[PDB]
Design a binder for this molecule. Structure first.
Ligand SMILES: CCNC(=O)c1noc(-c2cc(Cl)c(O)cc2O)c1-c1ccc(OC)cc1
Ligand SMILES: CCNC(=O)c1noc(-c2cc(Cl)c(O)cc2O)c1-c1ccc(OC)cc1
Ligand SMILES: [Mg+2]
Ligand SMILES: [Mg+2]
Ligand SMILES: [Mg+2]
Ligand SMILES: [Mg+2]
Lengths: 208, 208
């Protein structure tokens, strides 16, 4: 059922830095995850140009933002290419080891945490606002898997028999108690407008 | 020997817009091409994490900038994943049709040409400074090919028997007569520092 893995030392250090550093501009997490969704959406679009059957699992290319105040969750859903189990394990398809090295060298030369995505590890900025993150994903060449981590040096991977998606990625942010502003419609809309206004795919903000 | 192709109507319109629009901040072309090199370098690195033999064609992951005043060329070379012939034909591995649509809609809502890379078509910004662009490329799963275009609605593709590279992409910018400042060491260095200072791979500026 549930497999447990250790984060590579560099990734664990990245996550601790993200968790323990004083850094007020937390809102950038949303731009980073929307950007990842957009990169995955680009990939399925590109593949479908030479093979339209890659879209049998879903033709609509889009991003949904789903706040749930009762569950204290902000969920980001895309219909991008999705990840294989192998991808999930290999730091969610990132070059996380080398990217972390460059990121921390940059923080040495006056970078700040908002620049995290320039190093291919924008995903981990989720830990600015979330105590636990769940990544549900479905790639055309594999089954649906759930990745999960509350940090602390380990993550899990299981097959997901919960709600089939067809194709793409769902990121569920179980928010820290003092970060509930990211569930407020007005705040989400402000953030999307500020940082994600030219994204090439529809972004739908769900109502509660 | 030489195959000739028509650009898709949207790409041809993109290139004309790039060529004919008054836009002083031309220097951004270099950041866009360095960014593409960095994305291709990420890809070969990622693949090599699960298969180290992907690096038999070259272990060093880097970017070279080669100005040649006599030839009036600025050449950008990377050891990234490279492109197949199919990739070259399909708008150099870009989602150029949809990306152009989004780019032009953005230019309607107060974007400017410097934001071109947000729409996955940063390559075409080469035409800000170049009258002709040649793309030599070698992917592990194919032979070495040369793509070439002086715009005007068409491009060529040939097999390249010229100097084998091993793996990666070489972009040769045959510069417009009034854009020779991009061959000056001081100017190249200024531009790299301004826009490409946190790139995760060595950038070597060649001396003449
Ligand atoms: C191997 C082919 N699959 C993908 O590239 C992919 N599919 O899905 C995602 C993805 C990842 C994350 Cl963390 C998201 O928040 C949203 C996504 O769509 C990705 C993805 C996007 C970006 C990325 O690094 C910048 C790595 C992975
Ligand atoms: C299909 C797998 N190959 C690649 O992705 C690839 N290999 O090579 C390049 C590339 C392209 C360009 Cl236009 C460059 O200036 C530099 C490159 O390395 C690319 C490339 C980089 C970026 C891109 O779109 C943003 C498309 C293609
Ligand atoms: Mg790495
Ligand atoms: Mg919660
Ligand atoms: Mg397209
Ligand atoms: Mg020339």
């Amino acid at each position: 059922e549930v497999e447990t893995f250790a984060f590579q030392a560099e990734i664990a250090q990245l996550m601790s830095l993200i968790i323990n550093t004083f850094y007020s501009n937390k809102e950038i997490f949303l731009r980073e995850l929307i950007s990842n969704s957009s990169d995955a959406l680009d990939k399925i679009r590109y593949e479908s140009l030479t093979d339209p059957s890659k879209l049998d699992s879903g033709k609509e290319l889009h991003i949904n933002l789903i706040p749930n105040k009762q569950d204290r969750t902000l969920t980001i859903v895309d219909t991008g290419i999705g990840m294989t189990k192998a991808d999930l394990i290999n730091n969610l398809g990132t070059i996380a080891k080398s990217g972390t090295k460059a990121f921390m060298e940059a923080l040495q030369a006056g970078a700040d945490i908002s620049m995290i995505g320039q190093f291919g590890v924008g995903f981990y900025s989720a830990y600015l606002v979330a105590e636990k993150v769940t990544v549900i994903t479905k790639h055309n060449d594999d089954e649906q898997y759930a990745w999960e981590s509350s940090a602390g040096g380990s993550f899990t991977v299981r097959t997901d028999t919960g709600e089939p998606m067809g194709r793409g990625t769902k990121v569920i942010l179980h928010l820290k108690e003092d970060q509930t502003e990211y569930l407020e419609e007005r705040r989400i809309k402000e953030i999307v407008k500020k940082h994600s206004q030219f994204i090439g795919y529809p972004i739908t903000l769900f109502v509660e």
